């Protein structure tokens, strides 16, 4: 049961012979990403959706092993949906964080998924970073990927406590744009998702083209 | 239910590792069941690479090295009168004095003989175990076991441990009514080869000059085996017939 270890020895014998940002604003959170998907130096896809939905108001974006990121996100989404049905309550970002942290710690870093998770729940707005080995951290603004340094520079340039929705969207878009221009891993478009307290989540595909 | 309570009722025994039945048996705490196993229990280091551990710690000052069997020439062949087994009986010398003659041929039972090569301890231990298995089989079936069955038992046994570190090469020789005379060669790699003439050890090419015919008399066969061993080079001779093995000495 579970993930299989068959053909491990056989594979050994045969061998022997992206910019993601999250920004908090006064009434919610925003997550943004680029749309370039590459297989080595070759651009495989110029319009790839990297923003994934754990739950209707909890979204995430990942880096590392793409299959691991997708699989872990989907498994946690299924667990979150079942838990919400069981408790008859809106899912909380803290619960998804706990599930992700314990699942990643169980595999001792062998599941290569690094995540930014943003969400809104009845307790408020939340933004978290999740490492492959199981460590998690909280922050007001986060960056991830090969273009994370340029995006973080932009975020450190123009971030403040009193940010409106429009200012937060513009700041996230500018950070993704900087990662697009200055990093070979990014470059095509900007996808945004805005989660505001008391309202539905707004998914803007190709906000900047 | 009270057994569960005892399992959850309390440290010292856990540190002694005596909460496990195998540890108690190995140290003869609860009795002598350790000396009552038809299949012996072999200890391995509880690590990820037991094989590398053993190979590193065996290939390195005092007399505590694993004894290696003689690489002396051994010959076995079959004829109408049975089987002739000849072993060059030159004895190596060390810091010891032998009480009597050292036998390089294991007498599995009054009807089966084996030849030592590689690890002396492996050959002796596993051929004694094979003799026990053959005795149990003959008691159960009320008939003498065929040579093929015993050789296959030994081959399966050594194959189950293939790659662990065992080193042995043996010739099982026997004369039964159904099969006639029969010789098999079994080594630690799992190979099991039926044959007519076997020459093993240094000088096997010279001893492979066996003048061989299926009409040789007993005396002619003994002389031929002695001469082959001398050409390879005293000689120890065994003549295996349907009634058992007979030791001549020469």
């Amino acid at each position: 049961a579970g993930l299989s270890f068959d053909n491990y020895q056989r594979n050994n014998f045969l061998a022997e012979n992206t910019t993601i940002v999250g920004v908090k604003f006064n009434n919610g959170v925003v997550i943004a990403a680029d749309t370039r998907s590459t297989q080595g130096p070759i651009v495989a896809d110029k319009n790839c959706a990297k923003l994934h939905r754990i739950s209707p108001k909890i979204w995430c974006a990942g880096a590392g092993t793409a299959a691991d990121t997708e699989a872990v996100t989907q498994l946690i989404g299924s667990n979150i949906e079942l838990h919400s049905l069981y408790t008859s309550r809106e899912p909380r970002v803290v619960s998804a964080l706990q599930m992700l942290k314990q699942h990643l710690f169980k595999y001792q870093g062998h599941i290569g998924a690094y995540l930014i998770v943003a969400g809104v729940d009845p307790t408020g707005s939340h933004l978290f970073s999740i490492h492959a080995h199981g460590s998690t951290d909280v922050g007001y603004y986060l960056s991830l990927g090969s273009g994370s340094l340029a995006a973080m520079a932009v975020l450190e340039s123009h971030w403040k406590q009193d940010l409106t929705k429009e200012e937060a969207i513009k700041l996230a878009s500018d950070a993704i744009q900087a990662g697009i221009w200055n990093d070979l891993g990014s470059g095509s478009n900007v996808d945004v998702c805005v989660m505001e307290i008391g309202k539905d989540a707004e998914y803007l595909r190709n906000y900047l083209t | 239910m009270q057994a569960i309570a005892d399992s959850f009722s309390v440290r010292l025994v856990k540190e002694l590792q005596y909460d496990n039945e195998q540890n108690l048996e190995s140290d003869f705490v609860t009795g002598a069941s350790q000396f009552q196993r038809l299949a012996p229990s072999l200890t391995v280091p509880p690590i990820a690479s037991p094989q590398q551990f053993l190979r590193a710690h065996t290939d390195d000052n005092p007399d505590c090295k694993i004894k290696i069997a003689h690489g002396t020439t051994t010959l076995a062949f079959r004829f109408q009168g049975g089987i002739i087994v000849a072993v060059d009986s030159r004895a190596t010398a060390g810091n010891w004095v032998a009480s009597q003659t050292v036998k390089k041929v294991i007498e599995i039972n009054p009807f089966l003989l084996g030849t030592m090569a590689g690890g002396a301890a492996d050959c002796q231990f596993w051929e004694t175990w094979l003799g026990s298995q053959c005795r149990l089989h003959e008691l159960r079936e009320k008939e003498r076991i065929s040579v093929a069955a015993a050789s296959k038992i030994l081959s399966n046994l050594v194959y189950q441990y293939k790659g662990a570190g065992l080193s042995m090469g043996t010739m099982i020789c026997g004369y039964t009514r159904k099969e006639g005379p029969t010789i098999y060669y079994v080594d630690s790699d799992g190979t099991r080869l039926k044959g007519d003439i076997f020459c093993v050890g240094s000088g096997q090419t010279f001893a492979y000059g066996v003048n061989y015919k299926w009409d040789l008399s007993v005396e002619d066969a003994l002389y031929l085996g002695k001469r082959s061993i001398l050409a390879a080079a005293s000689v120890n001779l065994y003549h295996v017939t349907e009634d058992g093995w007979i030791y001549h000495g020469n």
Partner: protein, 205 residues
């Protein structure tokens, strides 16, 4: 210890004083030379007046702290408020029994009506030591002398605050893995008090 794992290059202090205990730390988390988070909160609460700081692997220490908090909730459901010694014992058992697979070090600061403020240190390996004050982290090595020259028993709250502020300011000054703001928790019979000091304040000491 694990390849490509987040480490804790912090500066941790815990000082016992006349009215209780104070736990202080910096707020810097780094990946090699890059600062991954400059406003991280390192003061972990495992019970209402039992707090800790962590060193070593971040994931291992977080898992251990979560298990300890769960254990203390179970204990509280039975016998009420646990003592600092009990929490330190649980931390020590978790660290020692898993020392071959997890890299973890914990400084525990607690207050209770019986013992009136205690500090325990569990370095790598899993041994436990009770001390009037404790320092830990990569930046602690630079303040071993200063603390030894400036600690007194039964100091007042303000004197303890000043001592911790000065020591952590020096640790931040000399250690590249330490920086940001200084965060402190004061545990006494009156309650729990949180304090923060900014670089423009402690850099002029």
């Amino acid at each position: 210890l694990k390849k490509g794992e987040v480490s804790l290059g912090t500066s941790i202090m815990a000082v016992t004083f006349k009215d209780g205990v104070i736990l202080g730390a910096d707020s810097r988390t780094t990946t090699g030379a890059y600062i991954a988070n400059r406003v991280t909160d390192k003061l972990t609460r495992v019970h209402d007046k039992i707090w800790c700081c962590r060193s070593g692997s971040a994931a291992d220490t977080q898992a251990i702290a979560d298990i300890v908090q769960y254990h203390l909730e179970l204990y509280t459901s039975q016998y009420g408020t646990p003592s600092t010694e009990t929490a330190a014992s649980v931390f020590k058992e978790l660290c020692y029994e898993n020392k071959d697979n997890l890299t973890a070090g914990i400084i525990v600061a607690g207050y209770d009506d019986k013992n009136k403020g205690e500090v325990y240190t569990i370095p790598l390996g899993g041994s436990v030591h009770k001390l009037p004050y404790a320092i830990a982290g990569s930046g602690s090595t630079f303040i071993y002398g200063y603390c030894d020259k400036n600690f007194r028993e039964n100091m007042s709250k303000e004197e303890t605050v000043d001592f911790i502020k000065h020591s952590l300011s020096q640790a931040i000054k000399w250690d590249g893995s330490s920086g940001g703001v200084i965060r402190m928790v004061v545990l006494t019979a009156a309650g729990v008090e949180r304090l923060i000091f900014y670089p423009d304040e402690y850099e002029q000491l």
